[PDB]
Write a protein that binds this ligand. Sequence first.
Ligand SMILES: *[C@@H]1O[C@H](CO)[C@@H](O[C@@H]2O[C@H](CO)[C@@H](O[C@@H]3O[C@H](CO)[C@@H](O)[C@H](O[C@H]4O[C@H](CO)[C@@H](O)[C@H](O)[C@@H]4O)[C@@H]3O)[C@H](O)[C@H]2NC(C)=O)[C@H](O)[C@H]1NC(C)=O
Ligand SMILES: *[C@@H]1O[C@H](CO)[C@@H](O[C@@H]2O[C@H](CO)[C@@H](O[C@@H]3O[C@H](CO[C@H]4O[C@H](CO)[C@@H](O)[C@H](O)[C@@H]4O)[C@@H](O)[C@H](O)[C@@H]3O)[C@H](O)[C@H]2NC(C)=O)[C@H](O)[C@H]1NC(C)=O
Ligand SMILES: *[C@@H]1O[C@H](CO)[C@@H](O[C@@H]2O[C@H](CO)[C@@H](O[C@@H]3O[C@H](CO[C@H]4O[C@H](CO)[C@@H](O)[C@H](O)[C@@H]4O)[C@@H](O)[C@H](O)[C@@H]3O)[C@H](O)[C@H]2NC(C)=O)[C@H](O)[C@H]1NC(C)=O
Ligand SMILES: *[C@@H]1O[C@H](CO[C@@H]2O[C@@H](C)[C@@H](O)[C@@H](O)[C@@H]2O)[C@@H](O[C@@H]2O[C@H](CO)[C@@H](O[C@@H]3O[C@H](CO)[C@@H](O)[C@H](O)[C@@H]3O)[C@H](O)[C@H]2NC(C)=O)[C@H](O)[C@H]1NC(C)=O
Ligand SMILES: *[C@@H]1O[C@H](CO)[C@@H](O[C@@H]2O[C@H](CO)[C@@H](O[C@@H]3O[C@H](CO)[C@@H](O)[C@H](O)[C@@H]3O)[C@H](O)[C@H]2NC(C)=O)[C@H](O)[C@H]1NC(C)=O
Ligand SMILES: *[C@@H]1O[C@H](CO[C@@H]2O[C@@H](C)[C@@H](O)[C@@H](O)[C@@H]2O)[C@@H](O[C@@H]2O[C@H](CO)[C@@H](O)[C@H](O)[C@H]2NC(C)=O)[C@H](O)[C@H]1NC(C)=O
Ligand SMILES: *[C@@H]1O[C@H](CO)[C@@H](O[C@@H]2O[C@H](CO)[C@@H](O)[C@H](O)[C@H]2NC(C)=O)[C@H](O)[C@H]1NC(C)=O
Ligand SMILES: *[C@@H]1O[C@H](CO)[C@@H](O[C@@H]2O[C@H](CO)[C@@H](O)[C@H](O)[C@H]2NC(C)=O)[C@H](O)[C@H]1NC(C)=O
Ligand SMILES: *[C@@H]1O[C@H](CO)[C@@H](O[C@@H]2O[C@H](CO)[C@@H](O)[C@H](O)[C@H]2NC(C)=O)[C@H](O)[C@H]1NC(C)=O
Ligand SMILES: *[C@@H]1O[C@H](CO)[C@@H](O)[C@H](O)[C@H]1NC(C)=O
Ligand SMILES: *[C@@H]1O[C@H](CO)[C@@H](O)[C@H](O)[C@H]1NC(C)=O
Ligand SMILES: *[C@@H]1O[C@H](CO)[C@@H](O)[C@H](O)[C@H]1NC(C)=O
Ligand SMILES: *[C@@H]1O[C@H](CO)[C@@H](O)[C@H](O)[C@H]1NC(C)=O
Ligand SMILES: *[C@@H]1O[C@H](CO)[C@@H](O)[C@H](O)[C@H]1NC(C)=O
Ligand SMILES: *[C@@H]1O[C@H](CO)[C@@H](O)[C@H](O)[C@H]1NC(C)=O
Ligand SMILES: *[C@@H]1O[C@H](CO)[C@@H](O)[C@H](O)[C@H]1NC(C)=O
Lengths: 365, 97, 49, 390, 258
Amino acid sequence: MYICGDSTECSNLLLQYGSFCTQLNRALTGIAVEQDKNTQEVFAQVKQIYKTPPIKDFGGFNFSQILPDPSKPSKRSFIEDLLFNKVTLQKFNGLTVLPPLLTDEMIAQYTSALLAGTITSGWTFGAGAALQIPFAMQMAYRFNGIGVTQNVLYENQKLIANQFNSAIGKIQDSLSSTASALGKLQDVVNQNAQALNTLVKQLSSNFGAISSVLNDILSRLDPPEAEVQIDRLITGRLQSLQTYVTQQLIRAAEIRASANLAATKMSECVLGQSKRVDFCGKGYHLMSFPQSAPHGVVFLHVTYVPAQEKNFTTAPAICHDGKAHFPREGVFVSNGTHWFVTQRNFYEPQIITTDNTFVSGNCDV
Amino acid sequence: RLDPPEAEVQIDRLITGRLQSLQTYVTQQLIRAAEIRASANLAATKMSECVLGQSKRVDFCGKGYHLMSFPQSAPHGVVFLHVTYVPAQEKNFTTAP
Amino acid sequence: MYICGDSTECSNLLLQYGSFCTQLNRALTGIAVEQDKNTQEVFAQVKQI
Amino acid sequence: LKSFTVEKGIYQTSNFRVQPTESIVRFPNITNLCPFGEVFNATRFASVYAWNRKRISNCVADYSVLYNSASFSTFKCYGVSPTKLNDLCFTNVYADSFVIRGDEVRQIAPGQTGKIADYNYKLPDDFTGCVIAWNSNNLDSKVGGNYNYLYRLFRKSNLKPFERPLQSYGFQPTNGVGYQPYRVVVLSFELLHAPATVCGPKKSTNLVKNKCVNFNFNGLTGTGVLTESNKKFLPFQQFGRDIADTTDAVRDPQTLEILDITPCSFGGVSVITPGTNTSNQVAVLYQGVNCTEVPVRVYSTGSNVFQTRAGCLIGAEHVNNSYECDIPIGAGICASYQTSQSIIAYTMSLGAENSVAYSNNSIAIPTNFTISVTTEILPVSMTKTSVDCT
Amino acid sequence: AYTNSFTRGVYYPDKVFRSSVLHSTQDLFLPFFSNVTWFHAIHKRFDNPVLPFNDGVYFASTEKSNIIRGWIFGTTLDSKTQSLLIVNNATNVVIKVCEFQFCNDPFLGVYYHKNNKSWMESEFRVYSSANNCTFEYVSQPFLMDLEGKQGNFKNLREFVFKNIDGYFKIYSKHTPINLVRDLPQGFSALEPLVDLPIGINITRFQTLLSSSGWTAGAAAYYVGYLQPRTFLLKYNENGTITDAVDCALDPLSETKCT
Ligand SMILES: *[C@@H]1O[C@H](CO)[C@@H](O[C@@H]2O[C@H](CO)[C@@H](O[C@@H]3O[C@H](CO)[C@@H](O)[C@H](O[C@H]4O[C@H](CO)[C@@H](O)[C@H](O)[C@@H]4O)[C@@H]3O)[C@H](O)[C@H]2NC(C)=O)[C@H](O)[C@H]1NC(C)=O
Ligand SMILES: *[C@@H]1O[C@H](CO)[C@@H](O[C@@H]2O[C@H](CO)[C@@H](O[C@@H]3O[C@H](CO[C@H]4O[C@H](CO)[C@@H](O)[C@H](O)[C@@H]4O)[C@@H](O)[C@H](O)[C@@H]3O)[C@H](O)[C@H]2NC(C)=O)[C@H](O)[C@H]1NC(C)=O
Ligand SMILES: *[C@@H]1O[C@H](CO)[C@@H](O[C@@H]2O[C@H](CO)[C@@H](O[C@@H]3O[C@H](CO[C@H]4O[C@H](CO)[C@@H](O)[C@H](O)[C@@H]4O)[C@@H](O)[C@H](O)[C@@H]3O)[C@H](O)[C@H]2NC(C)=O)[C@H](O)[C@H]1NC(C)=O
Ligand SMILES: *[C@@H]1O[C@H](CO[C@@H]2O[C@@H](C)[C@@H](O)[C@@H](O)[C@@H]2O)[C@@H](O[C@@H]2O[C@H](CO)[C@@H](O[C@@H]3O[C@H](CO)[C@@H](O)[C@H](O)[C@@H]3O)[C@H](O)[C@H]2NC(C)=O)[C@H](O)[C@H]1NC(C)=O
Ligand SMILES: *[C@@H]1O[C@H](CO)[C@@H](O[C@@H]2O[C@H](CO)[C@@H](O[C@@H]3O[C@H](CO)[C@@H](O)[C@H](O)[C@@H]3O)[C@H](O)[C@H]2NC(C)=O)[C@H](O)[C@H]1NC(C)=O
Ligand SMILES: *[C@@H]1O[C@H](CO[C@@H]2O[C@@H](C)[C@@H](O)[C@@H](O)[C@@H]2O)[C@@H](O[C@@H]2O[C@H](CO)[C@@H](O)[C@H](O)[C@H]2NC(C)=O)[C@H](O)[C@H]1NC(C)=O
Ligand SMILES: *[C@@H]1O[C@H](CO)[C@@H](O[C@@H]2O[C@H](CO)[C@@H](O)[C@H](O)[C@H]2NC(C)=O)[C@H](O)[C@H]1NC(C)=O
Ligand SMILES: *[C@@H]1O[C@H](CO)[C@@H](O[C@@H]2O[C@H](CO)[C@@H](O)[C@H](O)[C@H]2NC(C)=O)[C@H](O)[C@H]1NC(C)=O
Ligand SMILES: *[C@@H]1O[C@H](CO)[C@@H](O[C@@H]2O[C@H](CO)[C@@H](O)[C@H](O)[C@H]2NC(C)=O)[C@H](O)[C@H]1NC(C)=O
Ligand SMILES: *[C@@H]1O[C@H](CO)[C@@H](O)[C@H](O)[C@H]1NC(C)=O
Ligand SMILES: *[C@@H]1O[C@H](CO)[C@@H](O)[C@H](O)[C@H]1NC(C)=O
Ligand SMILES: *[C@@H]1O[C@H](CO)[C@@H](O)[C@H](O)[C@H]1NC(C)=O
Ligand SMILES: *[C@@H]1O[C@H](CO)[C@@H](O)[C@H](O)[C@H]1NC(C)=O
Ligand SMILES: *[C@@H]1O[C@H](CO)[C@@H](O)[C@H](O)[C@H]1NC(C)=O
Ligand SMILES: *[C@@H]1O[C@H](CO)[C@@H](O)[C@H](O)[C@H]1NC(C)=O
Ligand SMILES: *[C@@H]1O[C@H](CO)[C@@H](O)[C@H](O)[C@H]1NC(C)=O
């Protein structure tokens, strides 16, 4: 249709070139199936569709802005609607767009299931049957993972909850204000639209022929000359199609790389805690919350960042009675007069005792 | 069937067609090779991180908590037998921080 | 400068082929920008010397 | 698929395209007319010796207003035809107006016999003017007979082509058949000799809407559906184009109205089928197509038609429950073979709903484990291949 | 001197209709901020010369009562080659392509209030002599706002004349304004008015209008020359050009066009 739109003579001439049309159609079909595979791999990572209970007693943490809102016809969270609104934006010549297999509502359902599973069962739902656990205890486990004793959270729970809520509010405001955040998705959409537009525009090129209008050529020329001109146009338009399909293949390859990265991020941050530095955000990763965006995903990475560094004087070991005591976990620090043992990520000095240190060797080493 | 002076045109047409076919085939092969090389890099990483050691990354070396993996050779590919630990029977209890 | 280097007649004849060369220039410029993006991503990880 | 057995799934097949139903042509009635009405119709003509020569340019050579006459016996051109003159443009036209003997009508024709012809009107060897025969006895007749149109021109020297008998007392109606005076009119024109400055007429037909038809508007040929549109073309603007520079609106030459152009419906056709062994029953999906056009399971009727956001499905029962996806279709629709047996199309279910018993102080701890050995296959390489290009 | 001329230089590409489309076209345009010659029709001194026609011309004036009646187009202007005559009355124009012989001062010449303080028509030189002709055209007896109603100057008779592949085309638009001083700032597009397949083809043109001691005349008109350039035009909802950009004026405009 694209090369020889409604022209029996042009179709007959094109038949001579063999299976180029079949190859191009097969490549485009492969890309189309690959898109659905990418979305499936990224999002459909939960065996069951979980849902948060009506009572939102999450230890003071407030997930309203990311949880679904049943009032809206599309059960999308506040930030999801923000992203959908922020992302903003040929049928004549055989170009068709096939709808995605997974609709926006169902992708939102998948994201809601992942989020509810996270907040209600930590990382267990990603490794088996979802097991409930109070969110305070879950956060304590996250702190223990990053290396901070859980007493820190259990004693600063109100402050931590307030900080998390303020961070959520700030990210909401930033997304509502600036549109440069979704530049990646906007660029993907713009590139696809530009490629299609160029492909359509190529139909108005002579390629050396008398005219770019097949009907005009046929009407104004006799069988032989019309055949020559139509063959020239066929060559030009087939070159255009091949260029477009090759560009689409390369772009699909890069998009598949991005989708695999997104799936890995989902599995290793949303479904569990990650010790990989700067993979699930900058800082000591605590957790991640997924959100669906048009033709993409957004991760809200919640990380722990030390704030108020203070120096002390430190020593590698201590000499008590000719025996070298080393800290079991932590470091020896002094304010100038006394010596204490403290954990390495939060100043919590404690008296140095036999239960905080293990002995090895003697002083002289 | 043709005098060379005019047969050169037909020969040129055939040469152009076959050269275009070869170029298309080579481009497809290059793209497929890039994809297969990405897959091979992933497979090498999986071998290193699951067979040669225990992986803490979730859902990397199989579903559930990873214990180990065993490699198996297959034509033009590899097969991993990810061994995993999966909790089975859960009981509710009343907890306290 | 490559296809029809400094030739008005050749440029006019090439104009009939559409935006092939514009697409080529766009692709090459994209690659050129991507190189700097790669270097920035690899090295500029800390903004405090 | 080049196979006698096809596996379960959905397969692309021949594209479906709506064929046009009828041809529609629209054009203005008639435009400015060349000075041919006077030469082909008038009261007085020039003298035979003073044969007229008028240069005709900067007009439209409209043969409708000239061919509407019915007195002509045989007005045909050897190399061309009046009917196809509509899209033929001339360089300049010459009109020869004179009154001569009726029997000399053929003497004006090229390649004739008789020295009485070239005495008054020489015959060029490359005359493309089509001969015309018509009656002008009444116009050329006088009560006593007009002898002023004499043929005294008897120059002895040979006559060059366009360098500048009297058997009756005068032009009288009493002359018999074939002898009455006739006005010879020939529209002699030469092409590829002067800059194009004269063009031809047009033809019109009826108007139809809301159907896939082949339209011709002011020489703009195309195919599509013509619809009434709210676009406001400017008083002089004729066509309308989209961002990609493709025709989307057109102003009807006859009626001052704006018509939207929509390409005739088309799209891929997919065949949803279970395994050949399971059954030979299939369903057909017309992608992105209203099934008010599918009649034009290959048959006019669609059995249990089912409109869906991914086109129209034909031959598949619409089940309003939910199950896991078996054969994807699009927009969250999946088809599967179920219970008598038939193909059912439904909305895929993402999985079983679960409500975790989250609470203030409730924790679920496992008391047992299972060892799971799961496979994972990864391509590592593909066959090498070298090619002898030559 | 030629006075400032910011854009005032584009009429319409063609008949197509575009809505909310930024379209770029390479055609004969009057370059933005280019120099356009200025003339003042002095009613002894008389400003009415014969100016070359270098492939398109732009003529802008605020004259009232059709003081500048029409135009003379030709390559010899001596009856040797057919010439075009665009003298127009409020009724209609008498467009005439003939091998017309031209006089030194061939216009009607209603010298009212000039030297007699009365309305009279001294001469009738609009027809010097019709030695031979090839075609004539009379337009519909229209009634345009070309007559004399001073009030506040609102008759900006911007006209664009072109000759391409045997077609003579005239575009224009009546633009009301409020500043009786030099060409005010704004934007307006000149819809086409007439297309003619004359096929005659012009090397020079002249405008149509011993008064020693008489007060200097009060009438001004411009003559600008077109060049081949690329332009970007912003079609609005109605398919009317709200704005335009000259793709070669300066680097910023070049980037906008790109
Ligand atoms: C470096 O860190 C240590 C830890 O604080 C600090 O040494 C002393 O630790 C104790 C508690 O850890 C601090 O609080 C004191 O506790 C004692 C009971 O053990 C109280 O009696 C103290 O009240 C006063 O009386 C003490 C006895 O006379 C004084 O020694 C004390 O300074 C108070 O005036 C008090 O509540 C205590 O403040 C510190 N310091 C002392 C001298 O005890 C050590 O000071 C830190 N070094 C520096 C430079 O800050
Ligand atoms: C969890 O969700 C939100 C995340 O930031 C928390 O912010 C709350 O949202 C609005 C914003 O002020 C306020 O009201 C909440 O939302 C709507 C509309 O609020 C109405 O009342 C507030 C005054 O409180 C008024 O300013 C608004 O204009 C509305 O008239 C309603 O469903 C409730 O009123 C709800 O409280 C809250 O004030 C605001 N609270 C804070 C700390 O920002 C929200 O608090 C969180 N929800 C719970 C139960 O904790
Ligand atoms: C460790 O760093 C954290 C950074 O988030 C600190 O958490 C927040 O830090 C701010 C800055 O001080 C605290 O602001 C408080 O300010 C009050 C004085 O004003 C307060 O009360 C008035 C009403 O009377 C209210 O309008 C203000 O907004 C303040 O809330 C001080 O007395 C407090 O000590 C404190 O500085 C925040 O309270 C604190 N929490 C939150 C949710 O912002 C944290 O304070 C640091 N930890 C320490 C110093 O031990
Ligand atoms: C903590 O780290 C060091 C050491 O401070 C000391 O460390 C132990 C040995 C004990 O003696 C502790 O009791 C004690 O805190 C500090 O390094 C130096 O600190 C000073 C500031 O106090 C830095 O100067 C600051 O920055 C510039 C340059 O001096 C000026 O504006 C001021 O002088 C300002 O005070 C100094 O640059 C720094 N030495 C360096 C960089 O070489 C450290 O500052 C302290 N850190 C804190 C409180 O954050
Ligand atoms: C081409 O030929 C047709 C046939 O005459 C013309 O169509 C119509 O001609 C009449 C003039 O008699 C125009 O007036 C119309 O009168 C009818 C009532 O008979 C009225 O219902 C209409 O609303 C209209 O006033 C009519 O406008 C005209 N229609 C069109 C499309 O033109 C026609 O005028 C001739 N020329 C063209 C450009 O069509
Ligand atoms: C464990 O968890 C839930 C609820 O907790 C129990 O509820 C009683 C049946 C009893 O066992 C109490 O001692 C526990 O507190 C049980 O089933 C869930 O109950 C909640 C509401 O009570 C409901 O929302 C869930 O849908 C139910 N199913 C779930 C969470 O999967 C469950 O039967 C108990 N036993 C096991 C093995 O989980
Ligand atoms: C497919 O076509 C039918 C008919 O065109 C649509 O149903 C409506 O029928 C009325 C008839 O009065 C038409 O005027 C409407 O245009 C039709 N509505 C639409 C949206 O086309 C039917 O809705 C169409 N279905 C889809 C998904 O577009
Ligand atoms: C404008 O006014 C003058 C007054 O004489 C007229 O112009 C000529 O009028 C004669 C008589 O009809 C025509 O033959 C000419 O073609 C007119 N054009 C000239 C002299 O240039 C007439 O009343 C008006 N001009 C018109 C109708 O063209
Ligand atoms: C095209 O121009 C018309 C002008 O009428 C616009 O339609 C509106 O018509 C009302 C009539 O009172 C005017 O008050 C409005 O100013 C017009 N709206 C605008 C935005 O100009 C129409 O919107 C314009 N665009 C179209 C028809 O697509
Ligand atoms: C006008 O010409 C046509 C054909 O030549 C003819 O039918 C008709 O009789 C002529 N009219 C007169 C008055 O001669
Ligand atoms: C028939 O086709 C289905 C497709 O799923 C397959 O499961 C089954 O094994 C096949 N049985 C036979 C005998 O071919
Ligand atoms: C079709 O959907 C409607 C929703 O009201 C339901 O009543 C009906 O049972 C459904 N039909 C089948 C076969 O499920
Ligand atoms: C164009 O107009 C300006 C206005 O003064 C003038 O300075 C300039 O000299 C003119 N261009 C040329 C080549 O004279
Ligand atoms: C007065 O009228 C005549 C013609 O009517 C004209 O030629 C002359 O210029 C006018 N002024 C005079 C005669 O001073
Ligand atoms: C006028 O010019 C044309 C072409 O030059 C010529 O054919 C014609 O005979 C001339 N007519 C008169 C009266 O001079
Ligand atoms: C004007 O004069 C030339 C000389 O040949 C002529 O060929 C050409 O047609 C003319 N330009 C136009 C548009 O006629």
